[model samples]
Target chain A: VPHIPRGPVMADIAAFRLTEEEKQRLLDPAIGGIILFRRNFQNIEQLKTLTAEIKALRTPELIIAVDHEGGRVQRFIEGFTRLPAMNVLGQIWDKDGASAAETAAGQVGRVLATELSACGIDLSFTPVLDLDWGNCAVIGNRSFHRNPEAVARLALALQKGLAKGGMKSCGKHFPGHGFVEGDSVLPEDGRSLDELEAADLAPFRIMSREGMAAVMPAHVVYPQVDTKPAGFSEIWLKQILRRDIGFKGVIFSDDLTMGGIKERARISFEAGCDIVLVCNRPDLVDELRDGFTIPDNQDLAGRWQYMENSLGHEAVQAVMQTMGFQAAQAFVAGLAS
Target chain B: VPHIPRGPVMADIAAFRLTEEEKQRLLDPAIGGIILFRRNFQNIEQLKTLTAEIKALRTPELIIAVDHEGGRVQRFIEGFTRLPAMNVLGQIWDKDGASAAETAAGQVGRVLATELSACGIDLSFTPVLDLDWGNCAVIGNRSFHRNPEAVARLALALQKGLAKGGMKSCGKHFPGHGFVEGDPEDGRSLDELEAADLAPFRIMSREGMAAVMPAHVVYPQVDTKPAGFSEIWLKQILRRDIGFKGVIFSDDLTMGIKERARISFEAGCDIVLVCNRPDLVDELRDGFTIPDNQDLAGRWQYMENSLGHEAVQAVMQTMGFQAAQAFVAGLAS
Candidate 1:
């Protein structure tokens, strides 16, 4: 992997079409991936063109990812089917049980992943494992359930659905974050390591054991555990999740520019995170690209390779018109109702 | 610290008084501490004799501890003040606000810790940090509140009360066990977790958390192992991430996992509590040898100190003679 051109930085661009500066930034060996936000999307065609242009920049194309977990966190809504939050699926699980919920979850995952795959997006940080503790307002509807078993069953189905659509899944907010009221992206008192392991970490353990493609540590600090946020804690990423739980997937740090991690991008990288995302901030991107040196993470190139999307735009569209996709859409509509 | 004789095992006896067999087991190099249960308690003087006998068995002294977090978990109720469930304090916080609730928590801690210290107990796993989400039956009354801030503030106050009584506090069911329905003793499937930090534990960490206990519930989906047995939980998250420099006591091995004692020890726990099963204790002592733990010398030494009678009497006086006498009399009555 020497000079094979893998870097830890996942950067974002401002416009639909790359400018001269953006092109140079993307070309840098330190930049390994690009994240798309709502601002980056205008319509399906524009998104496709932008992604294709970005992909053509290198041979082993930089990873193309989005916060496309549906509900409020989705980046593309206009052209895409308005997907319900994952808790909607959890409600389905309550009425119909795991088999029915699993079917619906797979359908939603297929539709969500296929749509993103159609747009040339390789990864969606989906299947939120955080349990809805009914206290954390930030994660209220985003969480699957208060029960870890329900979250695991529903999430496994969603992962299967994503696989059918040819895109990989990344479980987010490692250990867990549902119990805390504040978002990791903002400054808030973090949960103790004990509190997190009891309930919040249940889903991540399930998904990791079942072969999740990647995992994202939260930006929130576990004060009892580490002074640094989970994304910047080697104990969290390397020891607990990776070694103990045996998660061999990619470790993506939650956006470093958020809350307590703004100036600590380098620390996030050094803390055993495979990738550190710097989104919605062009100035920070330029600063990181110029100032930071990519560390020795040559072996991680293989893990990063699993994130590549398999299907093209046409293949994804073909899957969308199938009975499973249609049923998933109807189920989601019923949920919204 | 080599051969300083700190073992990870914490065992329980079958009766109020120690038999020759029990004394022999206590003297073993592998047995580091003893946990007293309701079965081991009869009255104040008897309990004191039992504890003093257990302590005098070794020079460094085995840690004498209990699950005296009050409410249903309190071991010695007749002499103790019968401290209310932590949820009662949370209710106080709900009505009277943080200041009132904090004061009450401190008072309860002082009363609970002073009595235990007077009876020769060294530690009480008080101040359950798990948030009461209204789901976990085992932890419902034990938890302070659903809010992380409330749990943190109340727990810190309780720890202060414990300090005043010359006893250190241990935060139980680390990571948060209030959301799970099943007790760690029997098997239960715990649900999912998130990345947002646990607020109460965060506060406790900043306030100098002394000790922690891991749950036995298998977060089956998260890991095949239970929290007590998972290295990801004990070593990585607890020791490394949370930066808790205190001893970790495994929730009683007799609860379910009896064979995994060595595994729990290797997973960064300073103590593996084996309670309610003397046969298991004998088997564990016969099977395992005490390994050298250099990191444990300072923490073990700190946990061994007990407050003198004057100190306990002083705390009781500060609590007001009438109220202290009434509460103690009420428990006996």
Candidate 2:
């Protein structure tokens, strides 16, 4: 937990391996971490080789993250478990009881963390803590339960299992997205603070206090609470999420692609976000390179390095060579029809 | 949900119909609800009449609740669906995937809730949040699964099903019980329970579990008294730490749990259960006499309301006890 600083921007590359074009931009003192997608993966060996090259290029190895929330959100699935949707775990809770659902959730966590970490992934934005209000098609199964308690409980169980495999957990979609539908930003929940607190905000409240390492706020706005979406609203990012909720982890703004989000990297950082993600478009990287600026005092070196891989590529591979890894993989694989 | 001031004591009678003595005792403004047991039921007809008469006695209606967790703990089994042991569903999760298990759990909740609601019962103390630790004999089959996430998920489904069947649900053995052996009576380090068992309770509490039943067991590291009789456990942990705003029901004070009515009440128990020993009810009535505060009454009303009564009535008319029994019995196949 010592203070270390890495740049404030999280960038992406577009292949299984990076070209000099992607590598130099990442070296631009502004980049802190790399967010990987399905395009960056092909198989286990390629994943290990790709992330290894990325890790070797940085001084304090850049943290690697993926949308490994399991089920359809999972990125590296070619040689991994076909994890069930999180709502399926909630279904287990609905049927078998909390303990049974939790057992499955933990196993899911262990499987994802082990596989991802073994391949140099430092974090997985997982355990979507949103309440499945049945209206949001995007978050339906990604959400564990409609009840706040179930979401909070299942998230913690999954978080605990993630920690067991040397990976950290990140609760996504701040202020929640389940009450309304739409993955795009600028949409309003139109609900009051009291209404949100009763369900949507509960898991963030619990996980923030418990030990979640990072967070990625939603592009959606709570018009009743603030005018701008959570990622750009100071009322949400600083005044409430920081001052009120006491969140101390790294705050990531969901991908900045002007199609929906108009906020620049500076606006995101000014609103209290620790890392601004620029993904899917390289032109935006050059746009950010010219326009975005980090203050001298805000240098905060090595902060992003906290999420760096603890075990080396060789050691992570050694873990896979052990029986425990195979046993976990076998169990998760057994889950498929 | 109705809002009415009521008593704090949850007392039980000797049999199906109230005796002259039992009726008078229940009428004491000191009683808020009645806890029905196996002896209180002879058949569905008897249970309907019994609970109906009890409900007819008061304005808000006397809340009727039973330990209807299927398997060994299920009370009033003669005219009800024989519920699968909760762990059997866990085995389903182990073999048939979570979706399969969840469907069965929802069915169980709907079945249990429909039957009890038909009998005029308001709530069922269910979805035992305790993990099946294998060491606790009393909680063995009654518990759901060994993992906290699984327990919370399945419990949520079961609880939602209960709501669908027109019944409110209460998560039992608050904070959790199962890792410890013996009665609600095992000894363990506090952190072990806090880390594993507390996950399910924390989840249910956030769901605003309408009622909570504390474990009779004592964690020496946490408290000298059982969870129900310790304000440190009840108020400090459950009330504040877990931030539960639901009603607290003391597990039965029967079979010589002896007289500590006032003690449990002061320990932050919203409702103290006194059963079997007529003298025990008398002891609680005489010793614990407190005016019904508005807040305590508010929590009680939550326990009595059938927010899903619209759907519950349909289940009762269409499925009834025979349908529920047929469905539950066939689940094994």
Candidate 3:
């Protein structure tokens, strides 16, 4: 099996209908997945067509990903079941036991994945493993629970339900996002990695044990650990994720164009990203294509073939269409989307 | 009508089933209000009878109060409405509009007051105006919201429902309890009142609030305000600026006794307050009861008559029973 070339060849997601250049780029052998935004979402039919168009470009498959963890963080809310914030589940988990809390999380997960997969999408980044620190404004309601044990049990339950619907899970902002008291979207906001490792990494250890299929790095950096964000940090992405945690799955970065990345990294292309996310700045794709080394078409084709053989494309596609088959398909499909 | 004497009055509540000594204390004329705890509870009939017995001892109306804010802090959990904490209401409020949030608070208030009144309880220290400062473990889920405005609006709505149920409300741990990171049940906790001007007190002002219960806290050199005891805290800040006309309550001083750096009968009594001990109550009553000087009976009579005139007794009685019933229903109903 040809090893999939890293540090080049990845796809960018768009907010709206694909431009002519974007459609052509999806067909390019270097592109790997298509990310979706609120702009691309007109209706389920349109989204399905967009997914189909992206897949038509690649022979093996193209991954599709979205952030759909319900409550206020949900992207495609109008068409979906309005799930309560994770904090509500955490509160219930406090009063009740794990079974009841898991059930609540599972039901929400099943509905979220089912809706996304029904529209031919692969996986939505979810089951935020951040600890509830109470002081952080954004992550306050997003975290499953404050205690590591509760978060582990509840997140695993949520992941199980997502798998039931043929969708895969992406445990995100690893090793955790709960330690920073401020927003990472601003230049002034950052936290020490030592703080992140001690407090935030508790859930990542649990997620590793649970067999999470993907890991998304945080935009925030710990100046003590490394100057780069967790996404770009070799110490984080390689040393911690690969050597320590044994995360064999795809490593995705949060939107690289965010203010968190702008101050440090010059361009996402040179930042050693497998899937360099251009986000809303479709104008940057040409620059990425020109500066970034392009993968060989033959090598790309071979890796695609090998990945499909492992995931089983026909079985994956068939399951992707079914409500019962979305989770696993989401894990496989999210890598390309 | 005679003016009700100001200062914290020592009295026993639900702790005793009201023996003759407790009855005599109720009739002592120096005692102001009786606060009930969980021990006073037995069943609906027994509680009502006990309250009636205590009320019968006094010619003037005596203030009766209970803590029934529901959720974890609720004194009477069994046979009460099983209301969720203020956090739940705040959560729902964030998603829905302000109306639903108020309705939830009101429903809780109504249930709390209706039950307490049935048991002959008078007032409920409620609608904790504490902001969810995020660090407080004790005050967790007890606070209604983080914003001062949201807390005030929801608390007022709750008070409205309590009033409708024939109950009056007392907003507590005044100036705010949510700020302190430590548990006050153990000892006095200090908080930096950085933004602690009128922002928190604005709620009581907006509602034209009457009664206010001070917190078991000392503001660090901000104003030398010890919440329960300081003259500056009670007479100046709370009464003058906040315009709180009804009652300025000192939190249970006996509970805070361990924290006293120095102790004198007058200083201790005037400071946090001396409560719960039968001996201390007798001492305070005797000290205040000068024969040639104004008699304690005469003072008690005047205060009681004034409270009766203010209909404060009716207000307290109605709220206490309502809160009692709601608490009972929370476990049973």
Candidate 4:
């Protein structure tokens, strides 16, 4: 048995065969979850053995996550069931908003989760809930509608459908992204916070009522409200998301390698990111080996441990059943015919 | 034959009918044409006989016109084909600019003319060349599109279509109604003149343009030129610059009775208007009899008579073979 850090361990420790330093970091006290990339996957037999190795190392149980939302974003696409882009589902929503569109959305969600679960992934980050503001160049055609109700209704359909596939779903880039004139990956883009609250925040407000699991804040700054990007904004994280709306699920930041984050050596310890991911930058693995801690008034460690343990045992099955794989396959075949 | 003054005579004739004074004024050289209202029209038969009776009096051809643009503005509708509002044609223009939309617009123009011409009306203001600027509540849906090219394509289709039905199409309220935000009939309202450009004016600047109606707008800042009173807008601008060898019809100044210029005489005679209707015509006619050392510019009457003769001849020919051939060809096309 090896000791791992309190954050996420490397996903395929068994197949890749961890170095002595990597094994010691994997067995560290702080590492909590492992996010699987394409490099971590080879075949189903290799993946199941890899996930089984990572699970045997932890007593408290760690989380396993992947971005399997399908379309252009799906990573394990070749062996997996290829799904259409979110835009196609959005077009169906625009024409008719009956049980049929919802059922179609749910079936797609089921397929996404069902395929990901077979490869030993835990929660799949699914359902982009951004409203389609008409003139936005980046988020155009990616969003469901220029209206709020359409984004919320279609997003929830995907969320509930993914839940049926024995997987928990993460509704992401909260509070919204459809208003952006440029990509956040290029530079920090600012939108008026007042316009964000009035128009873009509408879809997330609808989802807040449904008790969704995990929200990822956007890398863009809403300067009028808080100068910090939403992923690191205390105004969003502490005041709005935690106290005001009462979002009980874990909050994930977009990739730290993304240009939105202003990297500070002490940010992992000073700033209150519970599980810091130095994604695509293996050099940062040494930084976490140095003691990193952020003090808070409240105890959130119990909540983190609960989510991690739940992800290991129960969360996968709960989300999978909610997504409904059998019913989804029939729906997709009907759509094709 | 006892002759009454022209001001009180026509009103009395219109109110009472065929007083000897009315018959005498109808023969006067000062009165060139008579406008018929819906009140004078009891039935199709009576209306036809009345038109024949009026035409019999004048050796010079009399040009009769009406506000028969249909859809909230149709006057003589009962015995005629019930016409759809011009906005219905505008609705089809928004979807796709296929030959089908163009053909439908032509059919609408033909129907408006066929109905009005059958009742013996000569000219119908068929095509509304107003651009839908999305703000003006009065002309919102009445306009085709906010874009100038779209308006030009549809307006030409409508004009050629109406010409087929024995009607001369008038591209109206020029040089542009794109700036007007309020109704000019209610009070003195000035267009702030932001997006109003000559693009809309250039649309109707082609050949076969019969009449150009100058806007009732006083573009105070844009051109120190009221659309009606300015020599630059009407004479030099429309005639010389744009090469519009057509009659400039001024909108009714007497309706709101808004005093734009101090002297009513100068205001009435400022523009080279073809037919000064109801009030201004009556004012000019009465002012003529009492010319009593009143340095009145009576050159308006000379201009009116010359233009009137040309207008009547053109309107007749347009309402005949030229229009009939165009209409049938459009329907078949």
Weakest 10 consecutive residues of candidate 4 chain A by summed lDDT: A180-189
What is the lDDT for A325 in model 4?
48
TM-score of chain B of each: 0.89, 0.91, 0.76, 0.70
Provide the TM-score, chain A, model 4.
0.81
Q: Tens digits of per-residue lDDT for model 1 on B39-123?
A: 6889999998998888778767788888777554566767667767677788889898999888888778877887788888888
Q: Residue-wise lDDT of candidate 1 within A100-154, one digit each (tens)?
A: 8888888788788888898889999887887765444445456777888899889
* Model 2 ranges off by over 4 Å: A1-5, A183-185, A259-263, A296-303, B1-333
Tens-place lDDT digits, model 2, residues B1-333:
333346888888887798888877877777889888766778988887888788767667788888778755667667677777687788789899888888788889888887788778888888789886644444655777988887888898898888877777788787677765421245567687887898988988898678788887777788888888899989999989989988888866664333476677778888878765678777667645574455786788777756443655565666354565577778633
Cα lDDT tens digits for candidate 4, B115-188: 55655556665456766553233343456566766677777777766765566666766666644442122112
Candidate models: Cα lDDT each: 0.74, 0.76, 0.60, 0.55
User: Per-residue lDDT of A112-207 in model 4, one digit per residue for the tens?
Assistant: 776666656667766677675432333433455666777777778887767656665566677786655331022233566567777677677667
The residue-level lDDT of candidate 1 at A331 comes to: 69
Error of 4 at B205 (Å): 46
Q: DockQ, per-model, please? A: 0.01, 0.01, 0.02, 0.01
What is candidate 1's TM-score against the reference?
A: 0.50
- Which whole-number lDDT from 0 to 100 does residue A312 have in model 1? 79
- Model 2 lDDT per residue over A198-240, tens place: 8889899999999787888886878888888889889988888
After aligning candidate 3 to the native by TM-score, how far in Å is the CA of A141 from where it should be? 1.3
